[PDB]
């Protein structure tokens, strides 16, 4: 239920939260070929799961 959006201003500064989110690979797609891919996380994404 948690997204990085939740940490900025309430706990941490925005810049640091963006840098935290960048540490993870998050899956996204489909692309033009209908395949899925991975990208660096962004402020709008939910926490990852193991």
């Amino acid at each position: 239920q948690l997204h990085f959006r939740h940490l900025v201003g309430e706990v941490l500064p925005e810049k640091r939260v963006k840098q935290i989110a960048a540490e993870y690979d998050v899956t996204d797609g489909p692309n033009d070929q209908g395949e899925m891919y991975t990208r660096p996380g962004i402020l709008g994404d939910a926490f990852p799961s193991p």
């Binding site: 201003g9 500064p13 925005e14």
Partner: protein, 74 residues
């Protein structure tokens, strides 16, 4: 006498003018109610306006509440 009957007949010739006077009186009694309701309109619609307009319309008295969050980032 014709003269007196004419005066009595004519006494009410100006009905419409008296009715306009009545309009004036009742509206004068009524119209101040616009101030309470105007204040409440503005009360409700103030937080919808831009922050700059809130600051301006209160001659700079109003400012963003300070609740201890969302401070500057060095």
């Amino acid at each position: 006498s014709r003269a007196v009957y004419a005066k009595l007949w004519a006494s009410t010739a100006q009905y419409t003018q008296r009715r306009h006077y009545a309009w004036y009186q009742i509206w004068s009694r009524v119209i101040p109610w616009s101030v309470p309701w105007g204040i409440f309109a503005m009360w409700m619609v103030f937080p919808a306006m831009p922050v700059e307009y809130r600051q301006a319309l209160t001659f700079g008295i109003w400012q963003k509440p300070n609740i201890g969050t969302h401070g500057p980032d060095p």
